[PDB]
Structures are given as C-alpha cells and as structure tokens.
C-alpha cells in the first residue's frame, strides 16, 4: 500500500483463499524429498487425504 | 364445489381405469356445504 | 346507543372435541406381512442396542 | 443409505400434466418435510411465491436455506418419487431450466429464487390445484452478475420516477441488459415498470441496500474513532486514509447518543443479513457435464 | 463406525450433585479430544471461562468452533457417557437451558457461550474439584442479535465514559444489556472492562468498512434522498423528513451506470468475504420437534 493513488479501483483486491481438502488431524504431516536428478527439494507429504474443494475467498 | 361433485359422481359412475382412492374427512362440513348454522 | 342505518351479520367458528365410531365390515382389507430384520448399532460399553 | 420422499397425489394427473413434468426430470426442488411421506404442497415453492401474497426476495431466500432440497426420480400419475439431497453424497442432476444458461464441468452451481416470471419457472397442477415452482439453478459467476444488474437496474428505474432529470432509461438498458460469461452472452429481460411501492420479486433487497449504504459512512467513521487504542491493528492506521475526504470531516457530536446506537443497531442487522443474500444460499459443485446429454454429476 | 466417550471421574460424586447432572441430560457440551476414554478436565467450557479471570466471549466462541461437540447421554456415580458428533449423522437432542427459550420446529439452532448467566451455565462438581460449563444453544434468529448486542458494547462503553457522564452510560445499556423476546426480557452480562477478542474482531470490520465506504454507489444514495421526504415507509421512519447532511455533500455529481456497475461489482466481493466474520461458530439444523417432551431432532 505504499503507492495507491495511481491505480483507481480494480487493484484493491490483494488475494484469495481456497480449501483443498481435509486430512487426518492428530497425525500431522511428514518430510520427504522430491526424486529428480537435480537436487533434494524438501517436500511435505500428508496421508489419507480427502479432497473437498472450496471456492476462492477474498482477504484484505 | 369440485370436491363435492367429484365425491358424488365418482361413487356413482364407478362400481360399473385406475381406482386411485380419494380420502374423505368430516371435520369441516361447513367448508364442504358452504352453510353456517 | 343509536342504530346506524346499516345492520350486521356476525360469523364465528367453534371447535369441538368429539368421540367417534368406526365400523369396518368383515374381511374387507387384505394385509401382507413380512418377517422383520435386526441390525445392531455398534457396542456401547454397558449396553447393546438392536 | 436409502433416501426417498414418496409424494402421493390425491387425484390423477392429466396427460398434459405428465409431459409438463417429464421435462423437469432432474430439476432440484426444495422440500419442507424430511419425512419419507410428504404432501404435494410442501415441495413446491408456491408457499412463498404466491399470487395471494406479495413476493419478497428474502422471504424466498430465507425459505430456500432452511429447506431440504430434493431431486425428481420418477413421475407417475399416482405418485412422485423425490431423491433427497444430503451433504457428502454425489448426485446426477440434469439441466432443464426455462431460462437457459450453459453449464461447464468443474463449475460452482448456485440455487436462487427465479428472477424471471413465474410461468417459466412454475408448472400448474390443475388436477390437484397446486403449483410447484422450481427454483432457478445457475452457475455462480452468472448468479452474481444477474443479481447485480437486476438490483442496480431497479434503483435506477425508481430514481427516474422520483425525478425525470436524474438518469436516462436508454443507458440503463444498455449496460444492464446483456450478461456475458465465458464466451457466452445471455440477454436478461427486465420488468417493464417499478410499480407504486414494491415491484414483483424486488425492492426487498433494494430498500435495505439503500438504507445500509447511507447508514454506513456515518457508522464506519464512528467505529474507528472509538476503536483506536494503543494495541490497534497495524492495518488500521493505514486504511483510515482510504476514506474520501468529506466522510472524514464528520463530527460525531451532531447526532445524539441515542441516535448513534440506533443507527448502528439498525444497520448491523441489514449488513449481517445483507451479506448472506450475496452468497446465494446453498452452493453446488459440478464434476462432469456433457452438453449433448444435459447431465451433471453434482455433489 | 462407532462414536462414544466415557469420562471417568477420579472420585465419586455426592448424591445431591449427581441429581443435578441428570437434569442436564441431553444437552450439548464441548470436549477437547475425541477418544474412548477422556479426563474430566477437558470436558466443560470451564478453562476458558474461569471464576478468577475476566471473561472474554469471543475467545469462548473461537474455542467452540474448534472443539468437538458431544451430546451428554448418561450419568453414573463413576462415569459420564457421551457421544461425539460426526459431520453426517442424525442425533436426538433435548432442551434444558436455564435462561429458558421455547424453540420452533425445523428451526436452525446455534451454539453460544453462556452470555446470560455464569451460574446457570455451569454445574459445580465439588467432589472432583471442577465445574462443568454447558454452552448456550439458541434459535439462530435471536442468536444473531445477541452477537450484535455484544460487539456494539465493546465500542460504546469505550466511547462513553461513566465519570464524565453518568446519564450516557444508562442510555447505552438500555439497548445492549437486555434482549427482548416474546413476552419476556433477559439481561445479558456485560464485562465491566472490555479488552477481549471483540476489539480484534472489530479491527477486521473497520478494515472492511473503510474499504466499502469508498466504493459506495450514488444511485442508491439519491433513492434514499428522494424517498424520505416524498414518501413514508416503516423502514425510512428512522430518517425523519430531515436528511443527513453528509449524503447531500457526497451525492452532488451526476449519475453514470457504468461507473456505478463497477462499484456494485466491487461491493459484492467484500460482502462475501465479510460474512465469514459474522457466523462466528457452529450451527445445528433441526428436522423435527416435540413440545411436550421438549425434544428436537438436530442434524
């Protein structure tokens, strides 16, 4: 919000949130690495997922 | 009026198709007969 | 207590609790009855409900 | 795992009545009773949308959200079989709404009261003397746009009736007529006249919207001036600048302390309830939709 | 497949108090964890609503949404048996809340912190050195009012100071302190010092209020400008034939729908985000009711 007087009204919105789904609580997640030739790429792995998508929700 | 005429003529012209049965109640005979005592 | 030039008719509905009779002839309606089914809800520690 | 609502018609349907309903084979219908056996009247929208009583938008909206939804399974003269809708289950829904709006896979469908005339939405049951009115089911990106234009148009159509100099009905028809979404353009027909006091299926939102919009600038500035404390939200100091200049200049002393609360207390109810209407109640998710077959596997 | 919970008391309860608990049968209460065996220190709402710390209601509300809900089922000298509430199941429920309300059929019920009474909400177990504080469930319409009754108070009390004016304090209390119901009046406990989570909640409102304030449409202003002086309704009685001076200052410029559409376009998005703030907790949808036995069938 340093410079807001140039753009009129459309730039107001900052971002959105959706909810990809619900997984097992009381278990958390785990750390692994991606397998590509390149390098580690530490990665978060969660089990027993249930995908329940939600529309985007604006935050500001 | 449709309800009364239907009770009468259905009973008559039946007994001699779907017999889907009309249900009959006595609670509001004033509503049926349009009379007030 | 002067009567204006127009008369009235009043209407009011009243409700009765009534006790009825029901006659039904012999062998009039036919019934077909099945065998029942059981199913147990999962175990509650002191009791089981079917 | 069995969900059925079997409706027993008191009297047999006409052949005309049958073909009228066969076209609404998979359309969603709200259900007043959850019991397996239900009266024909409960299922229609006719309870809230009637020739007898003025139709109000929130009356239908409040009705739709506190109402079970059901899908038509089989239509026979003797009885209706309706499949109940329950969260966590997948259903097969067909598109048959009279105002046609194209769907696409992976969209977010919406349920809303029919904006258009009752005849398109409703189906007369002359044999049983009831009217089953089907809610309008739409994709969300359109259901927002359609409600925005018809609501904005209503306030403009009344604005010129209060004063002829204010706005031109020509420009009002231009923007507000045509609805564009995803390369498809749909034209929506606006009511001919605003009416004396309340338009059919409109102004319930409008009266509330226009009062809430005027009660807002006085309230928003009152809230901040009392809200500033030593631990205030960091963003709070920032957006105090976002206000226009004149709204900043208000003096809270002019209104009496009895008024300020009642302006806020009156306003909060409109705002709290106003937000729900924008959401359009129940929201459906679609997985696979085939235009030739006109069937969506929704959940 | 099976949901249950037993709360094993360390020491046997007194013959007097076990009787008090059985009266609370069939009431919903919050449990910290879902397990076959649970401790009594995670059962009531007592930890977040103490006798020795100042009560914050917003904090209690946040806790309720997060925590699981269990329908109290059976009391013994040694045990409490409760059933955890899953997302998709039908559960019988009973009405036993001491600030008494009478529900209606198919009425959406909402769970709240015990705003009305600390004593009424909690049953004391002096045998096990604990108190179990049941949440208060309400029909949703009255619940939405009580939430607004609270949020206003944390602002008004701040705005009005008792030392400067004794009278001002009396007037604000009149609207917020008491909740009116059909032939009844209940007092709502108000924290003497308001420093709780609501101020944080308010900071989120004021961020939106400063935003929405800038994208207000003009045509919605003038319609109120004209309607108040020319016509009279129940809704516009709040504004007398007097009109607030700011609006005359803000609305001087002519009207263009295209500009208006952008503003109405923007406003819809922030009313959608804004609603999330309003619910502030769990909802129960009711499917039936028995007045004589005072029992619903929630879902």
XYZ file of C-alpha atoms in Angstrom:
745
model
C 0.000 0.000 0.000
C 2.924 2.391 -0.489
C 1.545 3.719 -3.820
C -2.250 3.577 -4.269
C -3.228 6.878 -5.912
C -2.230 5.869 -9.476
C -4.498 2.831 -9.895
C -8.155 3.597 -9.440
C -10.343 0.802 -8.068
C -9.547 -2.550 -9.642
C -6.219 -3.061 -7.861
C -7.926 -3.036 -4.469
C -8.112 -6.815 -4.056
C -4.996 -8.442 -2.575
C -5.519 -12.194 -2.574
C -7.792 -15.192 -2.289
C -8.041 -18.392 -0.243
C -9.495 -21.809 -1.050
C -9.530 -25.100 0.874
C -8.112 -28.087 -0.983
C -9.462 -30.666 1.447
C -9.382 -32.289 4.874
C -6.872 -34.847 6.135
C -6.218 -36.719 9.358
C -5.561 -34.469 12.310
C -3.668 -35.809 15.352
C -1.192 -37.194 12.807
C 0.249 -34.095 11.198
C 2.438 -34.418 8.130
C 5.886 -35.713 7.216
C 9.020 -34.576 5.420
C 10.476 -36.244 2.320
C 12.380 -35.187 -0.801
C 11.482 -34.959 -4.466
C 13.224 -37.580 -6.596
C 14.513 -35.601 -9.537
C 18.094 -35.820 -10.754
C 18.544 -32.182 -9.810
C 18.549 -31.944 -6.019
C 16.668 -32.580 -2.820
C 13.645 -30.273 -2.949
C 12.399 -30.990 0.598
C 8.711 -31.808 0.413
C 5.713 -32.158 2.745
C 3.795 -35.431 2.490
C 0.374 -35.942 4.082
C -1.553 -39.213 4.201
C -5.168 -40.294 3.958
C -6.329 -37.104 2.301
C -9.942 -36.265 1.447
C -10.299 -33.626 -1.266
C -13.163 -31.205 -0.611
C -12.588 -28.091 -2.677
C -13.970 -24.646 -1.891
C -14.383 -21.516 -3.976
C -11.936 -18.660 -3.626
C -12.466 -16.327 -0.670
C -11.083 -12.796 -0.748
C -8.903 -11.434 2.050
C -7.974 -7.788 2.567
C -67.626 -27.483 -5.286
C -65.227 -29.600 -7.322
C -64.600 -31.784 -4.279
C -68.274 -32.453 -3.643
C -69.221 -33.042 -7.270
C -66.294 -35.420 -7.567
C -67.219 -37.458 -4.492
C -70.753 -37.888 -5.800
C -70.082 -38.617 -9.445
C -67.053 -40.809 -8.796
C -69.017 -43.019 -6.411
C -71.864 -43.165 -8.915
C -70.053 -43.766 -12.203
C -67.770 -46.306 -10.540
C -68.968 -49.778 -9.401
C -69.899 -50.473 -13.034
C -59.233 -47.449 -15.238
C -57.383 -46.504 -12.040
C -59.197 -46.529 -8.706
C -56.759 -44.113 -7.023
C -58.779 -43.536 -3.893
C -59.948 -40.142 -2.710
C -59.589 -39.594 1.039
C -62.626 -38.297 2.917
C -62.861 -36.323 6.164
C -65.763 -34.854 8.128
C -64.011 -32.088 10.064
C -65.251 -29.088 8.046
C -68.702 -29.892 6.675
C -69.388 -26.169 6.722
C -66.441 -25.788 4.358
C -67.884 -28.593 2.252
C -71.525 -27.478 2.130
C -70.999 -23.683 2.293
C -73.500 -23.268 5.115
C -73.358 -21.644 8.522
C -75.693 -22.670 11.222
C -76.939 3.575 21.663
C -78.390 4.783 18.361
C -78.736 2.330 15.484
C -76.828 3.451 12.381
C -78.583 2.826 9.113
C -76.785 -0.470 8.399
C -77.259 -3.817 10.124
C -74.625 -6.519 10.643
C -74.180 -10.275 10.450
C -71.552 -11.911 12.656
C -69.706 -15.168 11.979
C -67.593 -17.230 14.397
C -66.193 -20.768 14.231
C -66.143 -23.100 17.227
C -64.123 -26.221 17.906
C -65.363 -29.460 19.417
C -63.506 -32.407 20.806
C -65.588 -35.324 19.602
C -65.538 -39.063 20.125
C -66.189 -41.100 17.004
C -67.170 -44.593 15.925
C -65.642 -46.679 13.157
C -67.341 -49.655 11.545
C -65.469 -51.955 9.210
C -67.051 -54.945 7.531
C -65.702 -58.485 7.632
C -62.638 -59.472 5.591
C -62.675 -56.100 3.904
C -58.972 -55.247 3.562
C -56.155 -57.715 2.965
C -52.697 -57.436 4.550
C -49.340 -58.957 3.571
C -46.841 -59.134 6.436
C -43.120 -59.666 6.265
C -40.511 -61.164 8.510
C -38.634 -58.466 10.459
C -34.960 -57.541 10.312
C -32.423 -56.896 13.051
C -29.320 -54.727 12.933
C -27.003 -53.928 15.829
C -25.682 -50.461 16.470
C -22.052 -50.707 17.490
C -21.066 -51.708 21.002
C -21.785 -49.301 23.828
C -19.706 -50.281 26.822
C -22.577 -51.224 29.130
C -25.382 -51.952 26.660
C -26.012 -53.064 23.083
C -28.955 -51.754 21.071
C -30.594 -53.633 18.212
C -28.129 -45.421 2.697
C -31.688 -45.035 1.395
C -33.092 -41.538 0.809
C -36.567 -41.322 -0.724
C -39.533 -38.977 -0.371
C -42.636 -40.534 -1.923
C -45.388 -37.987 -2.564
C -48.919 -39.317 -3.038
C -51.072 -37.261 -5.381
C -54.668 -37.006 -4.193
C -56.013 -37.075 -7.750
C -54.733 -38.475 -11.023
C -52.754 -36.301 -13.416
C -53.761 -35.312 -16.937
C -51.661 -36.491 -19.859
C -50.876 -32.793 -20.230
C -49.606 -32.663 -16.646
C -47.298 -35.636 -17.225
C -45.386 -34.310 -20.239
C -45.099 -30.952 -18.472
C -43.219 -32.592 -15.599
C -41.214 -35.153 -17.577
C -39.220 -32.196 -18.901
C -38.321 -31.392 -15.281
C -36.879 -34.871 -14.746
C -33.733 -33.988 -12.785
C -34.514 -30.482 -11.565
C -33.910 -29.661 -7.901
C -36.971 -28.970 -5.761
C -36.923 -27.708 -2.160
C -38.641 -29.915 0.419
C -40.411 -28.648 3.537
C -40.764 -32.026 5.288
C -37.945 -34.530 5.642
C -40.327 -37.446 6.260
C -40.483 -40.129 3.594
C -44.183 -39.435 3.011
C -44.997 -35.824 2.167
C -47.842 -33.638 0.956
C -47.677 -32.299 -2.600
C -47.872 -28.691 -1.387
C -44.802 -28.897 0.845
C -42.433 -29.475 -2.057
C -43.316 -26.521 -4.270
C -42.023 -23.004 -3.888
C -45.643 -21.880 -4.091
C -45.798 -21.380 -0.334
C -43.514 -18.359 -0.575
C -44.240 -17.305 -4.164
C -47.996 -16.952 -4.443
C -50.476 -14.853 -6.350
C -52.063 -14.151 -2.975
C -49.145 -12.597 -1.056
C -46.577 -10.114 -2.387
C -43.340 -11.952 -3.295
C -40.302 -10.692 -1.377
C -36.756 -11.753 -2.224
C -35.624 -12.562 1.318
C -38.841 -14.471 2.016
C -37.873 -16.937 -0.698
C -34.178 -16.773 0.134
C -34.716 -17.373 3.838
C -37.006 -20.215 2.806
C -34.507 -21.885 0.483
C -31.703 -22.054 3.053
C -33.853 -23.615 5.801
C -35.379 -26.087 3.329
C -34.309 -29.550 2.263
C -33.552 -29.851 -1.443
C -34.723 -32.857 -3.459
C -34.264 -34.203 -6.994
C -37.028 -35.765 -9.095
C -36.605 -39.505 -9.691
C -39.792 -40.812 -11.307
C -43.039 -39.089 -12.231
C -46.200 -41.180 -12.443
C -49.846 -40.151 -12.220
C -50.326 -41.952 -8.903
C -47.275 -40.526 -7.086
C -43.983 -38.601 -7.163
C -40.639 -40.084 -6.083
C -38.058 -37.497 -4.999
C -34.423 -38.135 -4.087
C -33.314 -36.151 -1.047
C -30.109 -34.090 -1.029
C -27.652 -34.673 1.818
C -24.102 -33.338 2.303
C -21.415 -35.860 1.467
C -23.277 -37.647 -1.345
C -22.889 -37.423 -5.120
C -25.953 -36.933 -7.339
C -26.789 -36.820 -11.045
C -28.530 -33.557 -11.958
C -29.886 -32.522 -15.360
C -30.238 -29.019 -16.802
C -33.805 -28.164 -17.784
C -34.393 -24.595 -16.541
C -36.595 -22.476 -18.832
C -34.248 -19.537 -18.923
C -31.326 -21.368 -20.454
C -27.809 -20.919 -19.092
C -24.964 -23.107 -20.266
C -23.010 -25.058 -17.660
C -19.432 -26.309 -17.794
C -17.583 -29.023 -15.921
C -15.848 -28.045 -12.658
C -18.134 -25.075 -12.101
C -19.872 -23.954 -8.934
C -23.627 -24.105 -9.414
C -25.978 -21.927 -7.401
C -29.575 -22.070 -6.193
C -31.538 -18.817 -6.172
C -35.160 -17.688 -6.476
C -36.361 -17.361 -10.085
C -35.814 -13.745 -11.144
C -37.949 -14.296 -14.234
C -41.713 -14.659 -14.482
C -43.448 -17.448 -12.592
C -44.884 -19.109 -15.688
C -41.449 -20.126 -16.950
C -40.444 -21.449 -13.513
C -43.773 -22.902 -12.300
C -45.896 -25.828 -13.529
C -49.643 -25.777 -12.919
C -51.187 -28.926 -11.436
C -54.816 -28.413 -12.392
C -55.914 -31.903 -11.333
C -54.699 -31.319 -7.769
C -54.979 -27.493 -7.610
C -51.366 -26.851 -6.586
C -48.471 -25.044 -8.243
C -44.974 -26.497 -7.955
C -42.489 -23.697 -8.646
C -38.912 -24.745 -9.369
C -36.001 -22.679 -8.031
C -33.650 -21.248 -10.619
C -30.338 -23.120 -10.592
C -27.397 -21.309 -12.134
C -23.609 -21.195 -12.241
C -22.193 -18.871 -9.617
C -20.319 -16.421 -11.911
C -23.641 -15.652 -13.580
C -25.866 -15.736 -10.487
C -23.805 -12.892 -9.059
C -23.851 -10.910 -12.294
C -27.581 -11.400 -12.885
C -28.452 -10.309 -9.350
C -26.130 -7.302 -9.560
C -27.696 -5.953 -12.742
C -31.341 -6.539 -11.825
C -30.783 -4.959 -8.408
C -28.863 -1.981 -9.792
C -31.452 -1.545 -12.540
C -34.313 -1.419 -10.046
C -32.836 1.529 -8.151
C -32.241 3.374 -11.420
C -35.766 2.700 -12.672
C -37.175 4.188 -9.470
C -34.650 7.036 -9.470
C -36.083 8.439 -12.696
C -39.632 8.042 -11.367
C -38.779 10.255 -8.402
C -37.203 12.764 -10.805
C -37.111 12.708 -14.628
C -33.889 14.714 -14.874
C -31.793 12.226 -12.924
C -30.911 9.415 -15.338
C -31.693 8.276 -18.872
C -33.508 4.978 -19.304
C -31.563 4.394 -22.522
C -28.124 3.991 -20.962
C -29.727 1.949 -18.179
C -30.937 -0.619 -20.697
C -27.579 -0.792 -22.462
C -25.225 -2.000 -19.735
C -27.792 -3.768 -17.567
C -29.411 -5.824 -20.336
C -26.715 -8.180 -21.585
C -24.889 -10.785 -19.486
C -21.557 -12.151 -20.726
C -19.774 -15.173 -19.278
C -17.065 -17.486 -20.624
C -17.596 -16.552 -24.255
C -21.355 -16.942 -23.969
C -23.723 -13.979 -23.923
C -27.184 -14.199 -22.385
C -29.783 -11.442 -22.516
C -31.916 -10.904 -19.421
C -35.309 -9.226 -19.693
C -36.041 -6.592 -17.015
C -39.534 -5.880 -15.673
C -41.442 -3.178 -17.545
C -42.360 -0.978 -14.574
C -41.126 -0.378 -10.983
C -44.632 -0.175 -9.539
C -46.119 2.006 -6.814
C -44.417 0.651 -3.692
C -42.992 -2.823 -4.296
C -42.013 -4.470 -7.586
C -42.653 -8.191 -8.046
C -39.704 -10.177 -6.601
C -37.755 -6.978 -5.952
C -37.107 -3.970 -3.670
C -36.879 -6.084 -0.525
C -33.137 -6.067 -1.105
C -33.190 -2.539 -2.510
C -34.754 -0.759 0.451
C -32.313 -2.497 2.778
C -29.374 -1.903 0.449
C -30.040 1.801 0.042
C -30.500 2.373 3.773
C -27.462 0.298 4.708
C -25.383 2.269 2.213
C -26.388 5.596 3.777
C -26.070 4.378 7.365
C -22.584 3.081 6.571
C -20.426 6.239 6.186
C -21.610 7.697 9.488
C -21.103 4.368 11.259
C -17.744 3.361 9.766
C -16.120 6.593 10.905
C -17.694 6.382 14.361
C -16.317 2.881 14.826
C -12.701 3.826 14.080
C -12.540 6.951 16.250
C -13.702 4.988 19.283
C -11.679 1.915 18.315
C -8.170 3.408 18.284
C -6.209 2.068 21.255
C -2.543 1.521 21.979
C -2.597 -2.038 20.612
C -4.521 -1.240 17.421
C -4.261 -3.491 14.366
C -1.376 -2.318 12.209
C -3.513 -2.181 9.069
C -5.984 0.029 10.953
C -3.750 3.106 10.846
C -3.340 2.557 7.105
C -6.903 2.253 5.798
C -8.007 5.322 7.758
C -6.599 7.178 4.739
C -8.679 5.187 2.238
C -11.855 7.084 3.191
C -12.932 10.019 0.994
C -12.220 13.489 2.317
C -15.764 14.595 3.150
C -16.641 11.422 5.058
C -13.573 12.078 7.208
C -14.833 15.533 8.221
C -17.936 14.240 10.040
C -18.481 15.297 13.658
C -19.978 12.571 15.838
C -21.460 15.190 18.185
C -24.193 16.280 15.752
C -26.167 13.066 16.200
C -27.388 12.423 19.742
C -26.021 9.457 21.674
C -29.447 7.819 21.482
C -29.368 8.128 17.687
C -25.852 6.822 17.036
C -26.550 3.413 18.567
C -29.903 3.022 16.827
C -28.285 3.978 13.527
C -25.653 1.302 14.203
C -28.047 -1.251 15.682
C -30.485 -0.778 12.811
C -27.589 -1.022 10.331
C -25.899 -4.142 11.674
C -28.972 -6.286 11.099
C -29.186 -5.171 7.473
C -25.466 -5.712 6.930
C -25.402 -9.079 8.697
C -28.392 -10.315 6.725
C -27.387 -8.475 3.560
C -24.157 -10.474 3.289
C -25.953 -13.832 3.307
C -28.083 -12.880 0.294
C -24.982 -12.142 -1.785
C -23.774 -15.706 -1.074
C -27.000 -17.151 -2.633
C -27.558 -19.861 -0.032
C -26.747 -23.460 -0.998
C -23.843 -23.934 -3.397
C -23.358 -26.973 -5.621
C -20.139 -28.355 -7.125
C -20.164 -29.965 -10.564
C -17.716 -32.605 -11.779
C -18.605 -33.724 -15.317
C -21.119 -32.057 -17.617
C -21.990 -33.190 -21.150
C -23.941 -30.650 -23.181
C -25.420 -33.209 -25.574
C -26.662 -35.322 -22.660
C -27.530 -32.343 -20.418
C -26.451 -34.101 -17.228
C -24.098 -33.091 -14.411
C -22.669 -35.318 -11.682
C -23.025 -32.825 -8.814
C -22.345 -33.112 -5.086
C -18.363 -46.726 12.719
C -18.873 -46.172 16.442
C -18.793 -42.820 18.227
C -18.732 -42.669 22.026
C -16.839 -41.289 25.007
C -16.669 -42.112 28.704
C -15.475 -39.554 31.242
C -14.110 -41.387 34.256
C -14.301 -39.372 37.464
C -11.453 -39.751 39.933
C -13.733 -39.668 42.982
C -17.414 -40.487 43.439
C -19.828 -37.543 43.268
C -22.245 -36.580 46.068
C -25.810 -37.920 45.959
C -27.030 -34.327 45.624
C -24.991 -33.253 42.617
C -25.422 -36.386 40.504
C -29.097 -35.441 40.588
C -28.177 -32.009 39.240
C -26.295 -33.568 36.324
C -29.136 -35.858 35.250
C -31.300 -32.775 34.805
C -28.699 -31.655 32.259
C -29.124 -34.877 30.250
C -29.360 -34.483 26.505
C -27.527 -31.148 26.433
C -24.632 -30.481 24.075
C -21.234 -29.802 25.640
C -17.706 -29.365 24.216
C -14.927 -31.932 24.690
C -11.256 -31.213 23.952
C -10.366 -34.578 22.390
C -12.196 -37.441 20.702
C -11.139 -40.673 22.416
C -12.760 -43.712 24.004
C -11.641 -42.585 27.456
C -11.420 -38.926 28.468
C -10.439 -36.871 31.504
C -12.868 -34.557 33.259
C -10.548 -31.552 32.916
C -11.230 -31.439 29.175
C -14.997 -31.743 29.393
C -16.590 -28.461 30.335
C -16.110 -24.977 28.967
C -14.619 -24.136 32.353
C -10.988 -23.487 31.461
C -11.674 -20.584 29.105
C -14.425 -19.199 31.397
C -12.893 -19.039 34.860
C -14.122 -17.573 38.103
C -10.850 -15.705 38.666
C -10.148 -14.199 35.219
C -12.167 -11.643 33.260
C -14.472 -13.407 30.788
C -13.928 -12.885 27.055
C -16.849 -14.136 24.988
C -15.191 -14.007 21.569
C -12.461 -16.268 22.918
C -15.123 -18.732 24.080
C -16.758 -18.574 20.642
C -13.467 -19.352 18.903
C -12.941 -22.331 21.200
C -16.388 -23.749 20.422
C -15.901 -23.966 16.653
C -12.553 -25.724 17.067
C -13.685 -28.200 19.738
C -15.751 -31.336 19.112
C -19.374 -31.478 20.306
C -20.756 -34.316 22.442
C -24.389 -34.991 23.363
C -24.467 -35.877 27.046
C -26.125 -39.282 27.319
C -25.934 -40.859 30.767
C -24.649 -40.080 34.260
C -23.419 -42.551 36.856
C -21.669 -42.218 40.198
C -18.373 -43.004 38.459
C -18.801 -42.057 34.814
C -20.242 -39.795 32.147
C -21.107 -41.375 28.800
C -21.258 -39.081 25.783
C -21.477 -39.491 22.025
C -19.197 -37.499 19.731
C -20.910 -35.620 16.913
C -19.896 -36.573 13.377
C -20.348 -34.422 10.232
C -23.086 -36.585 8.687
C -25.399 -38.271 11.188
C -28.770 -37.562 12.801
C -28.735 -37.028 16.560
C -31.553 -36.598 19.057
C -31.229 -33.579 21.329
C -33.013 -32.084 24.325
C -33.747 -28.610 25.670
C -32.650 -27.904 29.229
C -31.022 -24.448 29.259
C -31.833 -22.390 32.346
C -32.213 -18.990 30.683
C -35.226 -20.508 29.051
C -36.295 -20.248 25.432
C -39.009 -22.064 23.514
C -37.929 -23.339 20.118
C -39.932 -23.837 16.932
C -39.937 -26.790 14.576
C -37.322 -27.084 11.829
C -35.562 -24.118 13.418
C -31.844 -23.682 12.903
C -30.198 -23.693 16.326
C -26.872 -22.070 17.170
C -24.425 -22.793 19.997
C -23.085 -19.872 22.008
C -21.044 -19.227 25.116
C -23.091 -18.712 28.283
C -23.692 -14.996 27.827
C -26.773 -14.811 30.041
C -25.503 -16.385 33.266
C -22.269 -17.800 34.641
C -24.129 -19.613 37.420
C -26.830 -21.003 35.118
C -24.325 -22.350 32.591
C -22.130 -24.368 34.962
C -22.968 -27.247 37.299
C -20.464 -27.473 40.138
C -18.774 -30.785 40.890
C -17.257 -30.042 44.269
C -16.479 -33.745 44.603
C -13.940 -33.663 41.760
C -12.811 -30.028 42.240
C -14.375 -28.958 38.934
C -17.293 -27.138 37.359
C -18.845 -28.155 34.039
C -19.999 -25.181 31.980
C -22.518 -26.044 29.275
C -22.717 -23.795 26.209
C -25.967 -21.992 25.464
C -27.886 -23.044 22.354
C -30.420 -20.684 20.813
C -32.641 -20.403 17.779
C -30.491 -18.771 15.134
C -32.534 -15.540 14.666
C -32.168 -14.451 18.285
C -28.550 -15.620 18.336
C -27.577 -13.270 15.509
C -28.983 -10.410 17.580
C -27.051 -11.280 20.751
C -23.789 -11.319 18.807
C -24.510 -7.790 17.597
C -25.542 -6.816 21.129
C -22.059 -7.766 22.307
C -19.898 -6.289 19.554
C -21.617 -2.924 19.936
C -20.922 -2.854 23.665
C -17.153 -3.138 23.358
C -17.345 0.027 21.240
C -19.964 2.118 23.097
C -18.538 1.593 26.572
C -15.236 2.806 25.168
C -16.930 5.789 23.515
C -18.954 6.665 26.590
C -17.176 7.098 29.905
C -19.060 6.870 33.194
C -17.086 9.543 35.045
C -17.705 12.316 32.505
C -21.397 11.478 32.140
C -23.497 9.199 34.340
C -26.536 9.576 32.060
C -24.843 8.440 28.839
C -23.870 5.152 30.459
C -27.505 4.481 31.363
C -28.800 5.005 27.803
C -26.294 2.711 26.030
C -27.079 -0.089 28.474
C -30.775 0.160 27.602
C -30.282 -1.169 24.025
C -27.407 -3.609 24.532
C -27.825 -5.037 28.047
C -31.271 -6.593 27.636
C -32.519 -8.948 24.920
C -36.253 -8.761 24.256
C -38.242 -11.876 23.448
C -41.901 -12.752 23.068
C -43.428 -11.588 26.329
C -40.065 -11.798 28.056
C -36.862 -9.943 28.861
C -33.442 -11.352 29.708
C -30.394 -9.489 30.962
C -27.075 -10.031 29.227
C -23.978 -9.975 31.386
C -21.533 -7.368 30.129
C -17.874 -7.471 31.068
C -17.015 -4.433 33.182
C -13.808 -3.876 31.224
C -13.819 -4.590 27.511
C -10.378 -5.710 26.377
C -11.362 -9.128 24.948
C -11.250 -10.587 21.419
C -14.112 -8.434 20.068
C -11.803 -5.417 19.710
C -9.705 -7.687 17.481
C -12.880 -8.735 15.688
C -13.850 -5.067 15.324
C -10.480 -4.222 13.791
C -11.348 -6.630 10.992
C -14.717 -4.943 10.435
C -13.226 -1.451 10.344
C -10.786 -2.605 7.665
C -13.748 -3.602 5.506
C -15.829 -0.562 6.455
C -13.050 1.754 5.315
C -12.867 -0.237 2.073
C -16.594 -0.459 1.327
C -17.030 3.194 2.189
C -15.040 4.195 -0.863
C -16.976 2.111 -3.415
C -20.473 3.173 -2.374
C -22.780 3.780 -5.355
C -24.505 7.100 -5.928
C -27.860 5.969 -7.324
C -28.511 4.118 -4.070
C -27.928 7.365 -2.168
C -30.344 9.555 -4.134
C -33.128 6.974 -3.982
C -33.000 7.453 -0.215
C -32.573 11.209 -0.652
C -35.826 11.384 -2.601
C -37.848 8.695 -0.845
C -37.520 10.081 2.691
C -39.074 13.489 2.038
C -41.535 12.436 -0.682
C -42.826 9.071 0.598
C -43.142 7.420 4.002
C -42.476 3.790 4.949
C -41.732 1.867 8.108
C -38.118 1.390 7.023
C -37.404 5.061 6.387
C -39.028 6.238 9.634
C -35.559 6.270 11.224
C -34.746 9.220 8.972
C -37.414 11.816 9.594
C -38.240 14.436 6.988
C -34.743 15.561 7.994
C -31.971 14.107 5.810
C -28.335 13.710 6.982
C -26.100 16.440 5.614
C -23.159 14.285 4.516
C -25.157 12.499 1.831
C -26.107 15.793 0.185
C -22.368 16.540 0.091
C -21.297 13.132 -1.285
C -24.023 12.739 -3.962
C -23.797 16.071 -5.831
C -22.231 14.592 -9.013
C -24.450 13.284 -11.836
C -25.012 9.557 -12.348
C -23.381 7.096 -14.746
C -24.366 3.435 -14.599
C -21.037 2.145 -15.923
C -19.244 3.784 -13.008
C -21.993 2.510 -10.703
C -21.708 -1.044 -12.010
C -18.013 -1.151 -11.139
C -18.821 -0.022 -7.600
C -21.651 -2.514 -7.196
C -19.366 -5.072 -8.821
C -16.682 -4.492 -6.174
C -19.069 -4.339 -3.212
C -20.445 -7.841 -3.783
C -16.995 -9.401 -3.362
C -16.317 -7.799 0.031
C -19.747 -8.659 1.406
C -18.905 -12.282 0.599
C -15.601 -12.205 2.487
C -17.255 -10.241 5.292
C -19.899 -12.847 6.106
C -17.293 -15.345 7.300
C -16.785 -12.983 10.233
C -20.479 -12.954 11.178
C -21.298 -16.625 11.810
C -18.614 -16.975 14.481
C -19.411 -20.596 15.293
C -21.350 -23.886 14.783
C -24.931 -24.257 13.535
C -27.475 -27.004 14.156
C -30.239 -27.673 11.638
C -33.371 -29.046 13.283
C -35.603 -31.548 11.484
C -38.489 -32.045 13.947
C -39.710 -31.088 17.400
C -41.809 -32.390 20.283
C -43.139 -29.627 22.549
C -44.422 -31.838 25.376
C -41.129 -33.703 25.761
C -39.154 -30.572 24.799
C -37.014 -32.541 22.341
C -35.719 -31.737 18.864
C -34.023 -33.913 16.239
C -30.960 -31.972 15.124
C -28.527 -32.798 12.356
